[PDB]
Write a protein that binds this ligand. Structure first.
Ligand SMILES: [Mg+2]
Ligand SMILES: [Zn+2]
Ligand SMILES: [Zn+2]
Ligand SMILES: [Zn+2]
Ligand SMILES: [Zn+2]
Lengths: 56, 231, 49, 159, 65, 84, 147, 45, 56, 56
């Protein structure tokens, strides 16, 4: 996480199985490729914060 | 002064606490109304004695459980009046033999007598007083396999010897004249049943039993050969 | 329908690896806290954050 | 199960063993029949007893399954033997004291649910053996005609 | 271990073929390319089953239960 | 050769399989010949021969000359359940 | 299949391609401290036992072990072990009423499941009875899995 | 009592509690737990 | 460094990422299990009350 | 600073003892008591102190 790009909001789509699914355009800013890589997710708990994420 | 905390449901109040605890959520909840009760559940003389004792049990290769039973024992005796002496050699051997007993392991008075020179009779008195103290603070068979080891005898020989010891004790007749003589003679019978030579003097030496004693036991044991036969 | 391109196709030898998603995925909300710092514990088996 | 093979490992292989489906039309689905678990309407019951006899290795064959359930005289469930020697699928091996005794419950299904119901092995599909429709351009080095093999079915269409 | 039944691609049943395969190799000395053919494995999806297979159940049986 | 001392004091050979299962250490004992002498001064009295003394246990690498398996054959190994 | 992922045949998976077993081995042991306090393998009784885990104990045989062949799942308890408690020592919560034995039982992993393959009991070097348990599980190739 | 098996001779023991742990007829201290009698179910999937 | 400027936190999920073409740029697929574990404390009001009631 | 900082205070005439929350005990096997290194140091500083007292 060396870019401000490396942490970005997202809009959850619940889908089955196990891995996080995400489009491949976004693979570059994370410097990410899909082999064994993992990504921490963080849910904001407050309506205020929830707003900030969407808006920033 | 008080300071003891109890968990109770202010909405239920019906019983004392009857609850479950959720470790994963790290919270504790009343099983009834399903209310969360708590959150964020977090996840000089002596040392010298135990030193030399440690050395002794070590040289004796006794498993740590035995060592620690004897340690525990010795702590209880410690500085008490009634002991009144024995110079620290008698107590270490006594406490050891105790921990052996209490550990279901068996060691002969002679064996420990080989690790330490206790003069014998003095040892018996000390052991008895210590035994009395333990009660206040409120079985030969095991020897039979150990001896086979010394002779490296087959399993069947050992179990044969066990049957022999139980049968001999029931039939009484001399009551045993200490267990050691019975254990060794029982063996000597069992082995002579089988073809495997130890002869006699070799077992009397090796196991430190007077040859005359083994033969004497053998005659009486021979007399009762009738009922000692497992198959 | 035929593919306008032809595919390079054939057997090859493959190895499955220790890493398996089931052993990896975990999600924590309100777990246990370390006794010292009262911050969430470490590790999946301990159910850390 | 005393075998060396893990139990579900076995139940896997049993899952793959083809059975005689000719009349399967009239065997109802599991979820369709109103009984609890199974019956002779929605299922067929097979069982297998294997006890290794000889000193030499004994082989459990597909033919060793036996149908204990009433079939109502309809043709179903016989494990199929296409071997010339008349044995069929080799389920597991046994040495001497290793014994295997188990009960299998055969039910109706289709491939999309699990591939063990797939009736068809590979299906060869082809059309336009010559390239006349141009649905495919040919990768080549110098000439495509020489390199690319002549397909057999080409014989049944015009050059 | 022990003869994959069916086949990891085409789904043709490859299990029973195993015994007759070893029969052909031991008895008739025929090379594999001939054996598999005579067994009737046309595609190479099948062929890799028999040919590549390594049978360890034998070396498992030799332990006493 | 590799041996084990059980708690009760029975002592018996150790084959590696069991060694693993029982949380043991695979080792053989070591003995030394101790000759003791006394002088009085080069005058020599003393007790000798008769001692063979146990210093301690030495771990033993499998398949080495010391371990029991190094001499085993195939089916031999199978009885001991160590995969050749 | 872009960027080092890959597409795998579901039928092929279903037919056994790349299926593997996984054996986990849980080991536990009963011990003694001063020979005054002995841990014991026993099936704990919910009535008199304290600090007891909430996984179901129904599978345990009397001795405190799960007989092999039993299908188990996470949070189930494989080995029922118990320890003695001094009444005056704690008296925490209901311990005065429970009177007796603190529960120490090694559970199966929270997330795992499977079938118990093998269970063996053996005295170790110094004579303590202790047990190992072996739980096999089939791990089928999945979307997240690696190759 | 509960049924066990010996390590080597595979003899059925069924030793009780407070029998410690050893095989009768041989010295192996490794006892297997003698698989459950009741039925277990699988899905071939 | 360890316990202040950054720290181990709750409400977080970690897994393997893999790509999907059919997702819009900003989204992410989150597997049902994780979804069923993590949670967002929404507040009852006249608007959501019916929906929440259903959830409960 | 005459209020907050004096060389006199740089020298130690007396010493604070942190509450256990700084230096908590931990239990191994949960039946064995584990003590913190800070607790052991307090035990040393004490014992040493008592000794020096008596000798003095
Ligand atoms: Mg990567
Ligand atoms: Zn309540
Ligand atoms: Zn039905
Ligand atoms: Zn094929
Ligand atoms: Zn046996």
């Amino acid at each position: 996480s060396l870019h401000k790009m490396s942490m970005m909001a997202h809009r959850v789509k619940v889908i089955p199985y196990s891995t996080f699914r995400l489009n491949l355009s976004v693979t570059s800013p994370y410097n990410a490729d899909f082999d064994g890589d993992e990504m921490n997710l963080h849910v904001p708990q407050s309506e205020e914060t929830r707003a900030e994420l969407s808006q920033l | 002064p008080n300071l003891n905390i109890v968990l109770t449901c202010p909405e239920c109040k019906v019983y004392p606490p009857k609850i479950v605890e959720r470790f994963s959520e790290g919270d504790v909840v009343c099983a009834l109304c399903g209310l969360v009760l708590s959150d964020k559940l977090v996840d000089n003389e002596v040392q010298a004695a135990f030193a030399k004792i440690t050395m002794l049990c070590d040289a004796a290769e006794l498993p740590k459980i035995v060592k620690d039973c004897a340690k525990e024992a010795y702590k209880l005796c410690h500085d008490e009046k009634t002991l009144k002496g024995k110079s620290m050699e008698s107590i270490m051997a006594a406490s050891i033999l105790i921990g052996c007993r209490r550990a279901e392991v068996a060691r002969t008075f002679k064996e420990i007598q080989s690790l330490i020179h206790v003069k014998t009779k003095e040892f018996g008195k000390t052991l008895n007083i210590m035994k009395n103290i333990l009660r206040g603070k409120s079985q030969n068979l095991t020897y039979i396999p150990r001896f086979c080891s010394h002779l490296g005898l087959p399993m069947q020989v050992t179990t044969s010897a066990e049957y022999t010891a139980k049968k001999c004790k029931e039939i009484k007749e001399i009551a045993g004249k200490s267990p050691i003589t019975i254990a060794v003679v029982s063996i000597y019978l069992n082995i002579l049943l089988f073809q495997i030579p130890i002869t006699a003097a070799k077992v009397g030496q090796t196991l430190q039993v007077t040859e005359g004693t083994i033969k004497s036991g053998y005659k009486i044991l021979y007399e009762h050969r009738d009922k000692l036969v497992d198959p | 329908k035929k593919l306008m391109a032809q595919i390079f196709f054939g057997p090859t030898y493959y190895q499955r690896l220790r890493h398996m998603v089931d052993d990896k995925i975990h999600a924590r909300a309100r777990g246990p806290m370390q006794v010292l710092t009262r911050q969430p514990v470490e590790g999946r088996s301990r159910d850390g954050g | 199960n005393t075998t060396v093979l893990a139990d579900e490992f076995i139940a896997h292989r049993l899952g793959l063993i083809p059975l005689q489906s000719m009349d399967i039309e009239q065997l109802e689905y599991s979820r369709d029949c109103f009984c609890e678990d199974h019956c002779d309407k929605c299922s067929v019951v097979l069982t297998l007893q294997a006890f290794g006899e000889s000193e030499s290795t004994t082989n459990v064959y597909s033919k060793d399954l036996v149908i204990v359930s009433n079939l109502m005289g309809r043709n179903i469930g016989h494990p199929i033997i296409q071997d010339k020697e008349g044995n069929g699928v080799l389920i597991c091996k046994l040495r001497k004291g290793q014994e295997l005794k188990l009960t299998c419950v055969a039910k109706k299904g289709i491939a999309k649910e699990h591939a063990k119901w797939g009736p068809a092995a590979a299906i060869e599909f082809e059309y336009d053996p010559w390239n006349k429709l141009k649905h495919t351009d040919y990768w080549y080095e110098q000439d495509s005609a020489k390199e690319w093999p002549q397909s057999k079915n080409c014989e049944y269409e015009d050059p | 271990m022990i003869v994959p039944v069916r086949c990891f691609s085409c789904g043709k049943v490859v299990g029973d073929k195993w015994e007759s395969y070893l029969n052909l190799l031991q008895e008739d000395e025929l090379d594999e390319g001939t054996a598999l053919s005579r067994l009737g494995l046309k595609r190479y999806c099948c062929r890799r089953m028999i040919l590549t297979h390594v049978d360890l159940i034998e070396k498992f049986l030799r332990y006493n239960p | 050769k590799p041996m084990v001392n059980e708690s009760d004091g029975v002592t018996h050979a150790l084959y590696p399989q069991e060694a693993r299962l029982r949380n043991l250490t695979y080792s053989s004992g070591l003995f030394v010949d101790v000759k003791k002498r006394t002088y009085e001064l080069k005058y020599e009295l003393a007790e000798e021969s008769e001692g063979k003394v146990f210093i301690g246990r030495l771990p033993i690498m499998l398949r080495s000359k010391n371990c029991y398996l190094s001499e085993a054959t195939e089916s031999d190994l199978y009885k001991l359940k160590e995969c050749p | 299949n872009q960027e080092d992922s890959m597409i795998m045949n579901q039928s092929s998976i279903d037919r056994g391609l790349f299926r593997s077993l996984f054996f986990r081995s849980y080991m536990d042991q009963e011990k003694k401290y001063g020979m005054s306090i002995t841990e014991t393998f026993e099936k704990p009784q919910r009535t008199n036992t304290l600090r007891m885990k909430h996984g179901t104990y129904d599978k345990l045989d009397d001795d405190g072990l799960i007989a092999p062949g039993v299908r188990v799942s996470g949070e189930d308890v494989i080995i029922g072990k118990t320890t003695p408690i001094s009444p005056d020592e704690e008296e925490l919560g209901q311990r005065t009423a429970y009177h007796s034995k603190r529960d120490a039982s090694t559970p199966l992993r929270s997330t795992e499941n499977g079938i118990v393959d093998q269970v063996l009991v053996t005295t170790n070097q110094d004579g303590l009875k202790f047990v190992k348990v072996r739980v096999r599980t089939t791990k089928i190739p999945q979307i997240g899995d690696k190759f | 009592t509960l049924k066990y098996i010996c390590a080597e001779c595979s003899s059925k023991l069924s030793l009780s509690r407070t029998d410690a742990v050893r095989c009768k007829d041989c010295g192996h201290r490794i006892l297997l737990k003698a698989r459950t009698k009741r039925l277990v179910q699988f899905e071939a999937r | 460094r360890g316990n202040l400027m950054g720290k181990r936190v709750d409400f977080s999920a970690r897994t393997v990422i893999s790509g999907d073409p059919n997702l819009e740029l900003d989204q992410v697929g989150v597997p049902k299990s994780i979804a069923k574990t993590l949670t967002y404390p929404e507040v009852v009001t006249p608007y959501n009350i019916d929906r929440l009631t259903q959830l409960v | 600073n005459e209020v907050f900082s004096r060389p006199e205070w740089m020298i130690l005439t007396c010493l604070p003892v942190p509450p256990p929350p700084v230096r908590p005990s931990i239990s191994f096997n949960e039946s064995q008591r584990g003590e913190d290194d800070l607790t052991f140091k307090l035990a040393d500083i004490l014992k040493a102190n008592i000794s020096l007292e008596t000798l003095e």
